[PDB]
Design a protein around this motif. Structure first.
Motif, PDB file in Angstrom:
ATOM      1  N   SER A 277       0.849  -1.142   0.110  1.00  0.00           N
ATOM      2  CA  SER A 277       0.143  -0.152   0.060  1.00  0.00           C
ATOM      3  C   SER A 277       0.879   1.435  -0.101  1.00  0.00           C
TER       4      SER A 277
ATOM      5  N   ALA B 173      -0.019   8.728  -1.882  1.00  0.00           N
ATOM      6  CA  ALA B 173      -0.229   9.290  -3.153  1.00  0.00           C
ATOM      7  C   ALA B 173      -0.442  10.837  -3.007  1.00  0.00           C
TER       8      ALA B 173
ATOM      9  N   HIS C   4       2.609   8.861  -6.688  1.00  0.00           N
ATOM     10  CA  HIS C   4       3.709   8.170  -5.787  1.00  0.00           C
ATOM     11  C   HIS C   4       4.971   8.031  -6.374  1.00  0.00           C
TER      12      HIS C   4
ATOM     13  N   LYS D 183       5.690   3.862   1.742  1.00  0.00           N
ATOM     14  CA  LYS D 183       5.066   2.395   1.495  1.00  0.00           C
ATOM     15  C   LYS D 183       4.801   1.649   2.653  1.00  0.00           C
TER      16      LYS D 183
ATOM     17  N   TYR E 257      -3.715  -0.820  -0.675  1.00  0.00           N
ATOM     18  CA  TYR E 257      -4.506   0.411  -0.587  1.00  0.00           C
ATOM     19  C   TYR E 257      -3.638   1.449  -1.154  1.00  0.00           C
ATOM     20  N   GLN E 258      -4.127   2.614  -2.022  1.00  0.00           N
ATOM     21  CA  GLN E 258      -3.811   3.820  -2.307  1.00  0.00           C
ATOM     22  C   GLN E 258      -4.206   4.915  -1.490  1.00  0.00           C
TER      23      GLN E 258
ATOM     24  N   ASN F  38      -4.674   8.338  -0.678  1.00  0.00           N
ATOM     25  CA  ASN F  38      -4.690   9.498  -1.126  1.00  0.00           C
ATOM     26  C   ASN F  38      -4.552  10.663  -0.130  1.00  0.00           C
TER      27      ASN F  38
ATOM     28  N   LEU G 274      -7.249  -1.529  -4.586  1.00  0.00           N
ATOM     29  CA  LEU G 274      -6.717  -1.666  -5.976  1.00  0.00           C
ATOM     30  C   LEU G 274      -6.563  -3.165  -6.244  1.00  0.00           C
TER      31      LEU G 274
END
Length: 1191
Positions: A98, A101, A107, A140, A164-165, A167, A198
């Motif tokens: 993950s 971002a 990223h 990360k 997971y991203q 944001n 994702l």
């Protein structure tokens, strides 16, 4: 201490497969953190909550325990696409982490904080590092891919991890003049969510060994929270690829499974035990893809989607009504306990069905199926009703299996292809009857039958009787598998043939009411028949294998023989034996076509007759002849031989059930016997005379036995019985005159002769006389017989005891006694003054004190010897006057200087090589020693008065010298221990110094002879410790006479105080003899110097006496071992009846092995002697096969 509460006790052999995976917690996903964040607060605080969630998600990606071969990915939440390769020695871990971002730059993990700050532009270059948003757009959460420690892993736990991203945006905290990372403001133009998922995948590639995959159980209950959690994870993709070692997938409860198991592997499980217990399951193994629907309110949701290949061991749900369907290959179904339906496929199918089904379980056998095995791990044979011409398994209580074929017309196809195992060892088989199929019993494992029914004795005949009783047919082919013996069975012929495997295997025999038995002979075999319990008993038959080396024995002790007759036909003997009301038949036939005449039959515990005698007495014509009947003499239980002299201390074991014991005094001589008995424990009913006649009570103080007759005494068996008795033969009276002649033969049975002349004395002649004198000298032998006091006077009567040597070992005995020989004046010999006054008259004119009738017979012709009585009188007078060249050595209990514990005494002048020991009837020890110096004829006497009654206190030991022809000095050291005269000869200075060739010897008075001699002619070469003690065990296993008399003397001395109270003083003297049974070893596996450690039992029982206790007798199966303990002092005394010794050794006690001997290993009897050792706490307790000792 706290972690102790998380442990569980070990379980053994789980009858049914249980679930083992972890159970997921409630709200593990990002929804909970989203709800917590939803509270409108400062944005960076919401981001802190999200980041904390990500940190705990990545904190425990994997927990590895290579010691138990376990991997744990349950804590993984933020590591998606995780691929685990187990083929390499350190498993390869790959996956996506993950990531943080930003809206503009995305990223960028390759940039530092300052470079990112320049890229996005949220502060000034001057800004302190503490004012920058650390980890912005470059973090990360699984910071590094974790490194799995090297090991061999066979259990992988899989978690539901997504990538997971995260944001974020940059928020200016103005009051703190800093810049921080914040969740984006949703109020602006369309915003991307704070966390966006994702991927939802996972993959493990199995190695070559057996691996079990246990995905996290998200559907464990039907609770709405668990249900919705399972619904959310209903698309999680698992990719499992098994290896050649087999793959065991235990489905978690929700997701998309892709199982691709290697077809090479023998078993590929698919277990649904993780699902809720009461879950309706419907699975088909012939479908490549399938879905498991969950009945949510008003509709179904496909909570699983399993695409399987290579699975063949479907395991159903826990306790739910399911529908399992198999495929064309072999299958194994661990069905649920809620019933349901199992529509098997082709091939070979096995099932495991539990007990207490909540619904009848319907099994449908497709037309392509070939064989079926149904295991019942929890059900015993007692719960199955024997329904006829039906394959269904019917329970007495509870629902029952309902096996049906796909087409009933081909029901007959399952001939021998439908086996039903059972917990108790029974293995049923569907055998075709005349017009159908009936479930019949094919195998019976005795081990599991013993396990289920330990109260029931493991008798194969009892078992088959049960099977017939309950109504279960028997297959023509029955295997009695298990145990040390096999029984082959042909119920049609009603035949039981035995396959004896081991040698000298004791095996007990029992006839059957309906099924005739055949017994296979083997060397050393020994069978017992018990009392028959039923009417209309089918006969028995035995094929005898007489090797004339290890003869068999058929025993009838427990059968209670009442009416026994025999007959001959076709080179075989048919016998019939009837109890008081039952009956039984026997057929002895020989495989060698001939009768062995070696298989002795013990119909009665002391009436054992060889088959040869029976076949002689039994007539050749085929008619019944009564060989035994209970109307004869009653049960012969304890035979006592009367010609044995002095105390014999009769003992017999007690039997509570019978409460009737028989002691038979048997006389084999021509002289009437009087037993002057003395009861010490037990009571008497009298003596039996006729079968239906009350026994006349007889006083135990005196019992009369006529010559060549038997006296029977009946004793109650409620308490142990010990009787002391001293027998003496009736002296023959000779009163007439003249000359009489009798030879050795006609009165060697007689022990005492008495002469009472009326007018003239008879001329006593003893032909074949063999006088016993140690030296040929007449005067020296006269002194020897007179100095000890062996010549006795009783007023006017003289008694003298003389001995003879016959062909039989030992020495006879005979006394001459004459009344009236002393005159009236000579009746006062008690007064020494009168005797001294009469001595000169005796020397001068003996005839003044000589009876006129005895004048003509002053000399007696004892065969080769002449007894001149005047010489005896003169020598006695000489001894009397000298008392008031030979001196007397007397010792006391508290006299002596300091294995050879006690006191030291020594005789100054040396002796000869041979030795002689004398034991007075009163109980005095009179050790006899020589001088080997001819210049004066004089010998030594060692006197221990009251030795027999007081040897327990006595601890003294004698020393003496030995000269040789070549002037060799040999030291002899002798120790007295009851009937054992343990003498030790050492050369000392001979051929070396302080390294003497120590030689041992002993003498035991057997049959109570008051003289015993030891010449020591050969005594082998050296008489070592091993020679001594293995010799004693060798003689005692064969029930010799020396061991018997030591045992009897010890038991007699145990009752000095009257009751069973053995002091510690005696136990040091007494060794310990133990008998044990062992299965088998390899030859020579034990050696001297090794150590035994007694097992961790409560106590180990030892017996000081083994002859009359009847412990060393052959019993049971396997090899026998006889252990010889020098000093067992320190063991407590157990509760025993007066007469039996049973000492309990405490657990832990070490033993030191010496001289382990296996000469008689072919006889399956081994002698082993041990030592006392100590608390060293080392050794071994079991054989290499695992068999325990000291049973």
């Amino acid at each position: 201490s706290i972690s102790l509460g998380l442990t569980a006790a070990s379980v053994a052999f789980p009858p049914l497969i249980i679930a083992t995976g972890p159970i997921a917690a409630i709200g593990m996903g990002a929804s909970s953190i989203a709800r917590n964040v939803a509270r409108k607060e400062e944005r960076h605080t919401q981001w802190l909550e999200y980041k904390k969630f990500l940190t705990d998600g990545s904190k425990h990606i994997v927990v590895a325990s290579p010691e138990r071969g376990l991997l744990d990915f349950s804590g993984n939440k933020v590591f998606g696409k995780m691929v685990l390769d187990l083929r390499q020695s350190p498993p390869l871990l790959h996956g996506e982490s993950s990531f943080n971002a930003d809206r503009k730059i995305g990223h960028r993990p390759d940039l530092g904080d300052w470079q990112i700050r320049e890229k996005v532009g949220y502060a000034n270059s001057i800004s302190p590092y503490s004012s920058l948003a650390h980890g912005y757009a470059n973090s990360k959460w699984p910071r590094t891919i974790p490194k799995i420690p090297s090991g061999e892993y066979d259990t992988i736990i899989l978690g539901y991890g997504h990538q997971y991203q995260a944001n974020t945006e940059i928020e200016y905290l103005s009051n703190w003049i800093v810049w921080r990372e914040a969740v984006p403001d949703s109020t602006s133009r369309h915003k991307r969510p704070p966390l966006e998922v994702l991927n939802s995948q996972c993959t493990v590639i199995a190695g070559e060994r057996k691996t079990t995959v246990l995905p996290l159980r998200v559907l464990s209950d039907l609770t709405p929270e668990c249900t919705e959690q399972a619904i959310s994870l209903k698309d999680y993709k698992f990719i499992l690829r098994g290896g050649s070692g087999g793959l065991a997938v235990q489905v978690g409860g929700a997701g998309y499974y892709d199982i691709d198991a290697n077809l090479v592997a023998k078993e590929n499980t698919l277990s649904f035990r993780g699902l809720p217990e009461e879950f309706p399951l419907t699975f088909d193994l012939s479908k490549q893809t399938q879905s498991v629907m969950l009945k949510t309110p008003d509709d179904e949701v496909p909570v699983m989607t399993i695409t399987q290949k290579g699975i063949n061991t479907l395991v159903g749900t826990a306790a739910g009504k399911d529908r399992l369907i198999g495929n064309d290959k072999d299958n194994t179904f661990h069905t649920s306990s809620g019933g349901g339906t199992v529509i098997s496929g082709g091939g070979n199918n096995r099932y495991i069905i539990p007990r207490d089904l909540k619904t009848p379980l319907t099994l449908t056998l497709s037309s392509n199926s070939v064989s079926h095995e149904i295991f019942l791990p929890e059900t015993t044979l007692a719960e199955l009703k024997p329904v006829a011409f039906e394959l269904s398994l019917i329970y007495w209580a509870g629902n029952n299996i309902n096996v049906q074929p796909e087409d009933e017309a081909k029901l007959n196809h399952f001939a021998g292809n439908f086996r039903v195992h059972t917990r108790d060892g029974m293995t049923l088989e569907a055998v075709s009857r005349e017009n159908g199929i009936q479930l019949a019993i094919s195998l019976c494992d005795v081990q599991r039958w013993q396990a289920v029914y330990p109260e029931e004795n493991n008798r194969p005949d009892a078992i088959l009787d049960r099977l017939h009783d309950m109504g279960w047919s028997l297959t023509p082919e029955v295997r009695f598998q298990g145990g040390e013996t096999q029984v082959s069975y042909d119920p049609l012929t009603r035949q039981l043939v035995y396959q004896l495997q081991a040698r000298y295997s004791e095996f007990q025999l029992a006839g059957s009411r309906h099924h005739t038995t055949a017994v296979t002979g083997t060397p050393g075999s020994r069978y017992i028949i018990m009392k028959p319990v039923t009417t209309q008993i089918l006969p028995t038959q035995i094929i005898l294998a007489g090797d004339n080396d290890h003869p068999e024995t058929i025993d009838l002790l427990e059968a209670s023989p009442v009416l026994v007759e025999g007959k001959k036909d076709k080179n075989s003997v048919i016998l019939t034996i009837a109890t008081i009301q039952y009956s039984l038949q026997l057929t002895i036939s020989g495989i060698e076509e001939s009768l062995p005449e070696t298989t002795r039959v013990a119909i009665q515990p002391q009436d054992t007759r060889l088959l040869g005698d029976v076949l002689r007495i039994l007539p050749d014509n085929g008619n019944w002849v009564g060989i035994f009947r209970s109307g004869h003499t009653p049960t012969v239980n304890r035979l006592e031989n009367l010609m044995a002299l002095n105390q014999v201390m009769t003992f017999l074991p007690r039997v509570s059930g019978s409460a009737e014991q028989v002691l038979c005094l048997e006389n084999l001589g021509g002289v009437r016997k009087k037993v002057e008995g003395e009861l010490l424990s037990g009571k008497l009913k009298g003596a039996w005379k006729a079968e239906g006649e009350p026994t006349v009570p007889v006083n135990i103080s005196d019992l009369s036995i006529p010559p060549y007759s038997r006296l029977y005494l009946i004793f109650e068996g409620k308490n142990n019985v010990l009787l002391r008795s001293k027998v003496h033969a009736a002296p023959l009276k000779i009163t007439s005159a003249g000359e009489m002649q009798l030879s050795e033969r006609q009165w060697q049975q007689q022990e005492h002769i008495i002469v009472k002349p009326d007018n003239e004395a008879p001329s006593l002649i003893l032909s074949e006389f063999r006088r016993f004198t140690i030296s040929s000298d007449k005067t020296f032998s006269l002194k020897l017989m007179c100095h000890q006091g062996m010549v006795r006077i009783d007023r006017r009567s003289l008694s003298v005891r003389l001995f003879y040597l016959r062909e039989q070992p030992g020495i006879g005995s005979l006394r001459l006694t004459f009344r009236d020989f002393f005159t009236e004046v000579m009746d006062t010999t008690d007064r020494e003054i009168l005797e001294k006054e009469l001595r000169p008259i005796l020397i001068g004119d003996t005839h003044r004190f000589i009876n006129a009738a005895y004048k003509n017979h002053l000399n007696i012709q004892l065969g080769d010897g002449v007894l001149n009585l005047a010489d005896i009188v003169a020598e006695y007078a000489r001894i009397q006057k000298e008392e008031t060249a030979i001196m007397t050595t007397t010792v006391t209990t508290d006299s002596g200087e300091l294995d050879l514990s006690g006191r030291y005494k020594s005789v100054p002048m040396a002796r000869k090589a041979d030795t002689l020991y004398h034991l007075t009837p009163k109980g005095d020890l009179q050790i006899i020693y020589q001088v080997a110096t001819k210049m004066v004829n004089q010998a030594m006497i060692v006197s221990l008065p009251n030795y027999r009654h007081e040897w327990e206190k006595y601890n003294l030991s004698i020393l003496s010298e030995i000269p040789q022809n070549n002037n060799t000095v040999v030291h002899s050291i002798l120790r007295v221990n009851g009937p054992t005269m343990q003498v030790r000869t050492i050369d000392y200075r001979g051929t070396d110094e302080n390294n003497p060739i120590v030689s041992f010897s002993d003498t035991t008075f057997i049959n109570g002879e008051q003289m015993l001699s030891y010449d020591s002619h050969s005594s082998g070469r050296v008489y070592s410790r091993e020679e001594y003690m293995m010799w004693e065990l060798q003689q005692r296993v064969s029930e010799a006479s020396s061991a018997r008399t030591q045992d009897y003397w010890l038991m007699d001395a145990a009752v000095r105080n009257g009751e069973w109270k053995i002091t510690p003083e005696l136990l040091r003297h007494t060794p310990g003899y133990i008998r044990s049974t062992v299965s088998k070893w390899s030859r020579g596996w034990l050696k001297t110097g090794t150590i035994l450690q007694t097992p961790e039992d409560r106590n180990t029982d030892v017996y000081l006496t083994t002859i009359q206790n009847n412990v060393f007798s052959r019993q049971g199966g396997g090899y026998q071992v006889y252990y010889r303990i020098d000093g067992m002092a320190g063991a407590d005394i157990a509760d025993n009846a007066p007469g039996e010794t049973r000492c309990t050794l405490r657990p832990g006690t070490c033993f030191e092995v010496t001289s382990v001997d296996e000469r008689h290993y072919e006889w399956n009897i081994i002698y082993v002697t041990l030592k006392t050792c100590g608390w060293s706490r080392n050794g071994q307790s079991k054989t290499p096969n695992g068999d325990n000792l000291f049973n």
